[PDB]
Ligand binder design. Structure first.
Ligand code: FES
Ligand code: FES
Ligand code: FES
Ligand SMILES: [Fe+2]
Ligand SMILES: [Fe+2]
Ligand SMILES: [Fe+2]
Lengths: 153, 378, 378, 153, 393, 154
């Protein structure tokens, strides 16, 4: 597992969220994954809470369900701009990697702002063909989220 | 004039109260720095001598610090020389405070302890013989601690904390904060609205099952004496462990949301415990600081329960996310209407409990306290 | 301050572009006064329930088709606590419902339902003195003219036909003679007070001075009776198909630019057709919403011609890019000159129709209408 | 013909615009190219108009000429930050792909803003050895352009 | 609202840093009043037609070399409808012409041409009462002193030598004594009111307290006499400082090694001129700074780094190395950038209170020793005089 | 041969070192005899030599990091770098001249995020014992403006 394979998976992950084909987003994770949105201060102090906290793929599907069916929020999109992954350790089938990210938010009425940046802390595994996330934790540089966070990072 | 009240009644609120910047300056003077208690932090977050945190009361920067006698002290984060922030870290530990600018130094009470070169260097310059250290320092706050909640006031005349809270509030706080707590995360949510829209929101039982459609998809309130404070109580998921819970309060109350003028919330939603601090920033923006809590006695399964339920709250919450946005819907809907009034006529104002689904008595309650403090009564 | 030199519109005080209290009065006296505000095209809301959200000045609006071709418009502000009612740029609906507390509104903006109005279990709800009938966002008069939808808060505003006057009506009819189709929407945010863009569109004098593209023709200007509306008319590229066009008008006018106070433009440049909506945003910013048009009956070869001609207009227009920046150069050039005056004397103090380029008649025309609405005639 | 291929073309496309050596920008396209800048709104509704709309290399050459010699605007530069492309289909010579972009505008006066973001919808051909754009459509996430757009995305 | 405590400058009202009406008055009474505003160096506009755009206070300005070898400055605002006339930071022009309706201007800023002034085909154009000579941007008086170009709106400001006074003139002359060469420009955006920065640059008190770099890496530093000069206006100041080898717990001490060049012994000379110019000499690091207000809460510091035209490659390299001491990432300068913002935010709740400025006494005269705020109080003496905020004692 | 992806992985390690504030490692990306400078497009166009940071030894870099740790006063904050794909001007097996686009965000410990710098690195790379080492890095910033101060190198 090389950085450009992870880069390629990251392109599809990002493309998925950015194009609002949100139903596909859980498929990027194993059945029993961890996914968490957090910030450096929590990370630094070893605090476990997340803005999003999931320990199964089902919970990701349900989060998406709620986005579709229940939650009220104004329309907006993301634009993800990722950097090159760094691998901490890798096999032929598993990897620990971090990836730097920037996420713009563009309101439907036109305003664009830097909504989040940081790095994903990942554990990857290979099911069949391609890479799959067992863990993705989005450690955000800022402790501040503007208004609300409706789409996952 | 955009801030003229329509009567002595709190059934009409002038929309200009959310945008008038002279009035916001008055809020700083008469509320934040008046007869109130501002929430600073939990005593457990500053547990050792010399541990401190920086925060705000209203727009005014504050330092809150533990001393060796086990007591907690708070003072304005302003050097009594030329005005620099004293402490620059969000949190740390120290013996003395020292201003980075010209190194004046303060004790953990906020008294001025030392002036660099007060008596010159090499007998040259320094202060005049008439200068006296004792005569200069930042404003010091009164500190009150209630069930580990650290509050601060600038006013000599504010009632004691128990008296400010009232008995009903005190026992609802005591019910949640009964044994040692442990912080399990911090997040901040910047709100695109005047602070008052958020604080009205948290008191607004009327919206509970109208704005938040999560529950239908997948009541009861009390106001303090003042009006200032309030309590809201309640007695197809691929993975429903999200809403899986466990008994821990020997009363069956599954939802307790409680507010303390002018910007503290304590919440219990099933097993999800949190404190909120609400701070004004500009006329049209404010800041909501979330402190997620666990009990120090949590088992691993209990704690994971908390972690999972937290998906209900905070900036991405299945409820909360709508609370953060709705303020901004009001801020923007009233853009052309600074001259008009909010209509808050729902429910009757009375001694005792009310059903939460069809009343606005807690919102009116905020306004009674507000007008009192602001000198805006009729 | 914002002191007019005299009754002449030869001198405009630079402060008019920077004074925030004047801006507030523009909101009361112009946008919500005796004007027609441009909302959208009738073909953009073709079916009953089609709605769009826009602004009149600073005030958010809903414009919506109802039964039997009828179009209605109202303030996008809930009559409860002031939340935006419609949160989408466009959609289709039976009923409006506020997301906050689930009040509902018909297509005309009448309040038709209040959540728990009668109470629940005869607990809470509205007092008996409460009539849905007496609570509603402000409604706008609506006027359609050759497909253009306009809105006014004012019951005393003249008819769309008298407001425009005969000259303007014919020149509108000339371009909007048969069904049109939206081929694109772009918004251009302008780094100036709105008034600078509006004067710019009426400013025939810069035409061949600022724009050094359009030379590498009998001219003239119509101004209406009020001064508010105007028409300008004219009658080594490697790929010169940018500029190839076809006759389309019975008349060989190859440029008609037309303005309707306080913020509507209709452009015909060759085969490039567009509508512009100008909206104030802050004291030093505004927004220009472009809608590019073809005719329904365009051949494929014809449509393509519009698409290449569009290179002249819009945010990267070989002409229009320059119209966007030039107001910003004015905004900044006068940073130190709030107490001084723009000198606007080309073609004397004349404010009526003229032949020729060497005049500023229609610019002065805008100031005459502005001072009329604002109560700033001497 | 894969990601890194396209990424390397993009890098040179971006270096071209960013370093104001703009005369060479049109050489990135075939003689019979399509170039449009639009936004997600227009794109979602099938509306065809472009802030810029070109259907030949020469048309681009003219835009750049107008920029050098005719048009009036305050001096500014762009900075492109591109993500990894992603291929809809490819052979050995022809490719459909999309690249996410962020474009910063830095006025000559010093102010930096996020000026545009979105994805390129691309059609690539080969012209003996070196990759060339048959079509680039810059689909902007925002419907707002600040002030003016003079340099191409 | 904006009330001084008394007649001295030992107490400054914190409201002076946030009051917007007061800031408007600063524009009339300071920037467009009896002062000299720093524009640029003569050597940066050496050929006829060479111009730069900049500001005096908030007002945009163009400064330009004409064919008679003189330098002229005028307001960067067209006399027609207000457009900026010159749109480039710098360049070279014959005539200036507003881009909007092609009005033309010579290099003194007189209006020389109005498009279609007398009509086209006998129609339109200007009335007879419009005279080009009566209509132009405001011209500045221009003064050149040792290559420094300054402008004023006021016909009543003293000549530059008199405005500066003898102490300041000589010390400008000591550094600016032979041709200089620009070797670097950088701008620092400051997150405070302009005045917090100008006070800071006058503030000798903080020199060895805020800036810990020297004390941190000191091993063998020979000790110095420090002092402060204040001109009689109070508006202008100079801060100064004056084995065999200085030793530093630095891997590369070259950072700090230089050569004698002033025949002087003075190792640090920092000189300010009301309301916003700095000339500095820190060993061999020479620079000028231009400070401009931007909003009530922000300002801009424009740095011009200098060498001498006679520098040898070795000497040059010393300057390039010592430059790490200064600018936005200076071992000293980075801190001057942040500290005004610390004040701007510490006083958020304190607009009714006052700064206490009592070091070195109650006046604004020269002083030996760094443990003084005399040059700070000096600033406010000149400030309150321009502003009409003096009090009887 | 040095190619674009050795450089990009090198850049990613470079950025990671600064962004994670493991700043004691930053100087080791460089040769003992390196040049490092931070500048802006205007200085670069006009050929001016001064830097916001100007280093002609690795030791100069180390000294900078030491001042950062021991001496200097500043409000805590982090950078986040977002690097594009390098392009190589010249190249053999040991050495390359190269350029890489960068964006740098600064996030204050209090939460604010802003675009802090953007531009391109102008690199001269060599090889010591296997992987790359910068003989020279010039950060040429697109803007002439620095907000407040620059503490961390680009
Ligand atoms: S401002 Fe604190 S010591 Fe001077
Ligand atoms: S604000 Fe609309 S229902 Fe309450
Ligand atoms: S604004 Fe300058 S010529 Fe008209
Ligand atoms: Fe809620
Ligand atoms: Fe024009
Ligand atoms: Fe300093």
């Amino acid at each position: 597992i090389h950085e450009i394979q992870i880069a390629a998976f990251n392109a599809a992950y990002a493309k998925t969220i950015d194009s609002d084909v949100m139903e596909q987003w859980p498929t990027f994770f194993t059945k029993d994954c961890h996914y968490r949105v957090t910030n450096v201060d929590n990370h630094a102090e070893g605090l476990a809470a997340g803005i999003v906290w999931a320990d199964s793929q089902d919970m990701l599907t349900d989060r998406i369900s709620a986005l579709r069916e229940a939650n009220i929020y104004e329309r907006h999109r993301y634009r993800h701009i990722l950097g090159l992954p760094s691998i901490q350790s890798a096999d032929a089938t598993q990897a620990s990697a971090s990836t730097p990210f920037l996420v713009l938010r563009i309101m439907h009425t036109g305003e664009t702002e830097v909504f989040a940046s940081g790095e994903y802390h990942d554990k990857f595994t290979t099911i069949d063909g391609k890479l799959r996330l067992q863990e993705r934790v989005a450690v955000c540089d800022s402790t501040v989220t503007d208004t609300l966070m409706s789409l996952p990072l | 004039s955009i801030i003229q009240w329509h009567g002595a009644t709190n059934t009409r609120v002038p929309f200009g109260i959310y945008t008038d910047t002279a009035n916001a300056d008055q809020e700083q003077q008469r509320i934040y720095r008046g007869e109130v208690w501002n929430y600073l932090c939990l005593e457990s977050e500053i547990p050792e001598a010399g541990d401190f945190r920086t925060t705000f009361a209203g727009e005014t920067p504050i330092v809150v610090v533990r001393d060796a006698d086990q007591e907690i002290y708070a003072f304005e984060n302003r050097c009594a020389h030329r005005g620099a922030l004293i402490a620059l870290e969000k949190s740390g530990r120290t013996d003395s405070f020292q201003c980075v600018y010209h190194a004046w130094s303060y004790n953990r009470q906020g008294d001025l302890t030392g002036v660099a070169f007060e008596k010159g260097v090499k007998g040259q310059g320094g202060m005049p013989a008439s200068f006296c250290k004792e005569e200069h320092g930042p404003r010091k706050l009164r500190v009150a601690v209630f069930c580990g909640l650290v509050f601060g006031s600038f006013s000599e005349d504010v009632p004691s904390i128990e008296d400010y809270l009232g008995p009903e509030i005190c026992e609802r706080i005591e019910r949640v904060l009964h044994k040692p707590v442990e912080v399990i995360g911090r997040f901040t949510q910047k709100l695109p609205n005047n602070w008052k829209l958020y604080f009205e929101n948290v008191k607004d039982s009327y919206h509970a099952s109208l704005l938040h459609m999560f529950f239908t998809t997948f009541g009861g309130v009390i106001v303090d004496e003042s009006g200032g404070h309030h309590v809201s109580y309640s007695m197809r998921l691929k993975d429903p462990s999200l809403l899986e819970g466990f008994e821990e309060f020997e009363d069956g109350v599954t939802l307790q949301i409680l507010s303390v003028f002018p910007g503290f919330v304590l919440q219990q939603i099933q097993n999800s415990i949190a404190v909120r601090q609400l701070l004004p920033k500009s006329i049209s923006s404010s800041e909501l600081n979330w402190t997620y809590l666990g009990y120090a006695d949590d088992s691993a399964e209990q704690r994971k329960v908390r972690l999972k339920q937290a998906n209900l709250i905070g900036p991405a919450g299945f409820i909360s996310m709508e609370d953060g946005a709705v303020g901004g819907f009001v801020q923007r809907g009233i853009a052309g209407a600074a001259n008009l009034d909010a209509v808050i006529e729902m429910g009757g104002d009375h001694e005792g409990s009310s059903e939460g689904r069809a009343t606005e008595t807690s919102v009116r309650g905020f306004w009674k306290a507000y007008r009192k403090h602001m000198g805006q009564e009729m």
